[PDB]
Design a protein around this ligand. Structure first.
Ligand SMILES: [Cl-]
Ligand SMILES: [Cl-]
Ligand code: NA
Length: 129
């Protein structure tokens, strides 16, 4: 599923991500924009053999099991495929773990490089929330 901007904002709020660990909804929407272009089915292989899955490009090196990432962990206790669903529940639950891991949203390199410090409120502007 390819979310619209306000549509994703609403689903993230519904699942308790707005202001989670102090990150406003615009931060989460901006990260989703540049990680997946709002596409729940996005997958991308990393040079180290791991793969990033879903709307927030969660990495199989640490967070989900895809059965082909040697030495990886599965700290969200989830098949990586569950992160590709049209319902964003699993991606949100796992992202909550990731953003609580110590480095905040810097875990998402695209967030650090493209959202951090910017006018992230633009991403929810005009949204009925
Ligand atoms: Cl915001
Ligand atoms: Cl933080
Ligand atoms: Na893994």
């Amino acid at each position: 599923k390819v979310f619209g901007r306000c549509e994703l904002a609403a689903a993230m709020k519904r699942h308790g991500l707005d202001n989670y660990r102090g990150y406003s909804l615009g931060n989460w929407v901006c990260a989703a924009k540049f990680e997946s272009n709002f596409n729940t089915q996005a997958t991308n292989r990393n040079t180290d053999g791991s793969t990033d899955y879903g709307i927030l490009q969660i990495n199989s090196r640490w967070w989900c099991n895809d059965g082909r990432t040697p030495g990886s962990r599965n700290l969200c206790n989830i098949p990586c495929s569950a992160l590709l669903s049209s319902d964003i529940t699993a991606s949100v639950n796992c992202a909550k773990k990731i953003v609580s891991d110590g480095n905040g949203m810097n875990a998402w390199v695209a967030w650090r490089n493209r959202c951090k410090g910017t006018d992230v409120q633009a991403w929810i502007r005009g949204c009925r929330l």
